[PDB]
Structure formats: C-alpha cells, structure tokens
Scaffold this active site. Structure first.
Site, PDB file in Angstrom:
ATOM      1  N   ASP A  37     -17.034  35.429  29.192  1.00  0.00           N
ATOM      2  CA  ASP A  37     -17.698  35.827  30.416  1.00  0.00           C
ATOM      3  C   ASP A  37     -16.594  36.592  31.431  1.00  0.00           C
ATOM      4  OD1 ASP A  37     -18.888  36.392  32.694  1.00  0.00           O
ATOM      5  OD2 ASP A  37     -19.895  34.278  32.812  1.00  0.00           O
ATOM      6  N   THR A  38     -16.191  37.705  31.328  1.00  0.00           N
ATOM      7  CA  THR A  38     -15.152  38.439  32.183  1.00  0.00           C
ATOM      8  C   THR A  38     -15.749  38.558  33.736  1.00  0.00           C
ATOM      9  OG1 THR A  38     -16.267  40.633  31.522  1.00  0.00           O
ATOM     10  CG2 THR A  38     -14.254  39.842  30.314  1.00  0.00           C
ATOM     11  N   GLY A  39     -17.203  38.312  33.987  1.00  0.00           N
ATOM     12  CA  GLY A  39     -17.352  38.112  35.270  1.00  0.00           C
ATOM     13  C   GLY A  39     -17.159  36.785  36.038  1.00  0.00           C
TER      14      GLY A  39
HETATM   15  C1  LIG Z   1     -18.695  36.887  48.403  1.00  0.00           C
HETATM   16  C2  LIG Z   1     -19.999  35.873  47.575  1.00  0.00           C
HETATM   17  O1  LIG Z   1     -19.610  35.614  46.235  1.00  0.00           O
HETATM   18  P1  LIG Z   1     -20.336  34.244  45.486  1.00  0.00           P
HETATM   19  O2  LIG Z   1     -18.963  33.405  45.242  1.00  0.00           O
HETATM   20  C3  LIG Z   1     -21.036  34.670  43.884  1.00  0.00           C
HETATM   21  O3  LIG Z   1     -20.315  35.836  43.401  1.00  0.00           O
HETATM   22  C4  LIG Z   1     -20.632  36.045  41.857  1.00  0.00           C
HETATM   23  C5  LIG Z   1     -21.933  35.671  41.221  1.00  0.00           C
HETATM   24  C6  LIG Z   1     -22.194  36.054  39.871  1.00  0.00           C
HETATM   25  C7  LIG Z   1     -21.256  36.557  38.808  1.00  0.00           C
HETATM   26  C8  LIG Z   1     -21.408  36.927  37.441  1.00  0.00           C
HETATM   27  C9  LIG Z   1     -21.516  35.649  36.563  1.00  0.00           C
HETATM   28  N1  LIG Z   1     -20.369  34.874  37.310  1.00  0.00           N
HETATM   29  C10 LIG Z   1     -20.278  33.363  37.537  1.00  0.00           C
HETATM   30  O4  LIG Z   1     -21.343  32.755  37.653  1.00  0.00           O
HETATM   31  O5  LIG Z   1     -19.021  32.812  37.817  1.00  0.00           O
HETATM   32  C11 LIG Z   1     -18.899  31.893  38.527  1.00  0.00           C
HETATM   33  C12 LIG Z   1     -18.055  30.606  37.404  1.00  0.00           C
HETATM   34  O6  LIG Z   1     -16.482  31.204  37.893  1.00  0.00           O
HETATM   35  C13 LIG Z   1     -16.619  31.723  38.958  1.00  0.00           C
HETATM   36  O7  LIG Z   1     -16.216  33.033  39.265  1.00  0.00           O
HETATM   37  C14 LIG Z   1     -17.283  33.850  39.772  1.00  0.00           C
HETATM   38  C15 LIG Z   1     -18.684  32.880  40.250  1.00  0.00           C
HETATM   39  C16 LIG Z   1     -18.324  31.856  39.716  1.00  0.00           C
HETATM   40  C17 LIG Z   1     -21.799  35.753  35.263  1.00  0.00           C
HETATM   41  O8  LIG Z   1     -20.375  36.727  34.765  1.00  0.00           O
HETATM   42  C18 LIG Z   1     -22.811  36.426  34.673  1.00  0.00           C
HETATM   43  N2  LIG Z   1     -24.229  35.565  34.961  1.00  0.00           N
HETATM   44  C19 LIG Z   1     -24.687  34.978  33.737  1.00  0.00           C
HETATM   45  C20 LIG Z   1     -23.866  33.799  33.321  1.00  0.00           C
HETATM   46  C21 LIG Z   1     -24.041  32.685  34.248  1.00  0.00           C
HETATM   47  C22 LIG Z   1     -24.495  33.268  31.800  1.00  0.00           C
HETATM   48  C23 LIG Z   1     -25.769  32.839  32.063  1.00  0.00           C
HETATM   49  S1  LIG Z   1     -25.000  35.737  36.288  1.00  0.00           S
HETATM   50  O9  LIG Z   1     -24.407  36.464  37.452  1.00  0.00           O
HETATM   51  O10 LIG Z   1     -25.612  34.552  36.863  1.00  0.00           O
HETATM   52  C24 LIG Z   1     -26.219  36.884  35.706  1.00  0.00           C
HETATM   53  C25 LIG Z   1     -27.664  36.291  34.962  1.00  0.00           C
HETATM   54  C26 LIG Z   1     -28.637  37.427  34.511  1.00  0.00           C
HETATM   55  C27 LIG Z   1     -28.459  38.766  34.463  1.00  0.00           C
HETATM   56  C28 LIG Z   1     -29.467  39.782  33.942  1.00  0.00           C
HETATM   57  C29 LIG Z   1     -30.659  39.529  34.314  1.00  0.00           C
HETATM   58  O11 LIG Z   1     -29.174  39.877  32.667  1.00  0.00           O
HETATM   59  C30 LIG Z   1     -27.081  39.400  34.964  1.00  0.00           C
HETATM   60  C31 LIG Z   1     -25.984  38.393  35.786  1.00  0.00           C
HETATM   61  C32 LIG Z   1     -19.760  36.866  39.335  1.00  0.00           C
HETATM   62  C33 LIG Z   1     -19.423  36.670  41.051  1.00  0.00           C
HETATM   63  O12 LIG Z   1     -21.435  33.864  46.577  1.00  0.00           O
HETATM   64  C34 LIG Z   1     -21.686  32.237  46.371  1.00  0.00           C
HETATM   65  C35 LIG Z   1     -23.124  32.058  46.571  1.00  0.00           C
END
Ligand SMILES: CCOP(=O)(COc1ccc(C[C@H](NC(=O)O[C@H]2CO[C@H]3OCC[C@H]32)[C@H](O)CN(C[C@@H](C)CC)S(=O)(=O)c2ccc([C@H](C)O)cc2)cc1)OCC
Lengths: 99, 99
Positions: free
Chosen positions: A25-27
């Site tokens: 997961d590069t995100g």
């Molecule tokens: C300044 C505010 O920012 P913020 O902190 C949140 O910012 C972020 C929010 C999300 C992400 C992307 C997300 N990464 C993530 O969750 O990483 C966590 C753990 O490592 C930390 O690093 C970054 C956050 C922490 C992941 O890559 C992709 N995901 C799925 C994955 C979970 C597998 C099921 S998904 O996004 O849920 C998603 C679901 C369905 C779809 C379509 C329907 O298919 C598209 C996307 C990166 C940064 O606010 C706090 C509330």
C-alpha cells in the site's frame, strides 16, 4: 519481482512466526495489521484513515518478511479492514513505483 | 519514471480542466478526489477504509492526466482528506510495483 495492479497487490508475509496475507500500500505511511498476538512491549497509538481514527498497538523493531524480503520496523496492530504494508517497510525491501 | 517511497508519492494530476496534487495509491481499488463540482450525472456511494465509511459521489468515464499519462475511469468525489489515485487508473498508466 514486478507486480502489476490489475488485481490487489496482495503478498504473503511472515511475522511472529505466522504467515498472513497483506496489501502492498503505497498510500499508507505506516504498516497496520489486523488484531493479532505479538510478543514484546507495545505502546498505545492513534492513526487516522479515510473514515476516521482507530486505536492501535505500536510494536517497534519487529522482524517481518514480505514476499521473501526481510524487514525490521514498526508494525501497528488494530482494527484495520485489511493488513496493509506501508512505506516504512516498503522502503526497506526496496520497493518503488514505476511507469 | 521511477518513484521511490521515502516520501509520499505525490504527483500532479489534471482533471476537469484543473491541476491538483494526488497520491499514487496501490492500496486503493478506485480513485477518490477532493470535493469538486464536476459536470454530468453521478450516483451516491459509500467507501470505507481505516476509521469507517464516508459518502462520495461516483462519476464515470472521467478523464485524468497523471504525470502526462492519460487515464479514463470512475472517480469518487467527496470529503476525502487527500486526492487518491487508485488501481483503476494506475493500471492505465502502466504503473507497477518493483522490488
Ligand atoms: C491531513 C488529514 O489526513 P488524515 O491523516 C488521512 O489521510 C489519508 C487517508 C487515506 C489514505 C489511503 C489509504 N491509506 C491509509 O489508510 O494509511 C493509514 C495507515 O498509514 C498511515 O499513513 C496514511 C494514513 C494512515 C490506503 O492507501 C487506501 N485505503 C484502502 C486500504 C485501507 C485497504 C482497504 S482507503 O483510503 O481507505 C480507500 C478505500 C476504498 C477506495 C475505493 C472505493 O476503492 C479508495 C481508497 C492516505 C492518507 O486524516 C485523519 C482523519
């Protein structure tokens, strides 16, 4: 190896002596695994995602083998929907994006 | 090109005639973009990740240019904290993981 993205980039990992499936997961900045038992000390931590924050257990300097590549780093354990391998470990195994 | 993962893989995209910064996210099945008033029809959807679900608007057959590489697919618009380029578009630009 070279991994295409037509399917979810799921790989087998070995952590604490147990095999699991996890998503490259590069995100994700950090690595988050579903609830499991790991030995050693841990500290409470908060991490935020697309839908809000969860409480996790932070384990530092944990040995983890990802698709045959060894890493030793931080692993968060908590109610994530799926095991995700984040950049903190993807960098250790030399993973890059290419197009 | 090759993108290392020491830092977040942020790149410039072009959508609906606007330039934006977005995250190349192999952990996302689909693409989720910040609130923007795109023209045309759409249908409500719920997408979930760490922290729960959020409401988004699903637009189909949307053109996005990612680092000069064009891609056409579904885009989910809603209160996401970051612009997320998911596999549905990453595949179209020939993006792979390599280690
Ligand atoms: C300044 C505010 O920012 P913020 O902190 C949140 O910012 C972020 C929010 C999300 C992400 C992307 C997300 N990464 C993530 O969750 O990483 C966590 C753990 O490592 C930390 O690093 C970054 C956050 C922490 C992941 O890559 C992709 N995901 C799925 C994955 C979970 C597998 C099921 S998904 O996004 O849920 C998603 C679901 C369905 C779809 C379509 C329907 O298919 C598209 C996307 C990166 C940064 O606010 C706090 C509330």
């Amino acid at each position: 190896p070279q991994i295409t993205l037509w399917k979810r980039p799921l790989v087998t990992i070995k952590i604490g002596g147990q095999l699991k499936e996890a998503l490259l997961d590069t995100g994700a900045d950090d690595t988050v695994l579903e609830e499991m038992n790991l030995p050693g000390r841990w500290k409470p931590k908060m991490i935020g995602g697309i839908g809000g924050f969860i409480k996790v257990r932070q384990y530092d300097q944990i040995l983890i083998e990802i698709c045959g590549h060894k890493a030793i780093g931080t692993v968060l354990v908590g109610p994530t929907p799926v095991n995700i391998i984040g950049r903190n470990l993807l960098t250790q195994i030399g993973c890059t994006l290419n197009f």
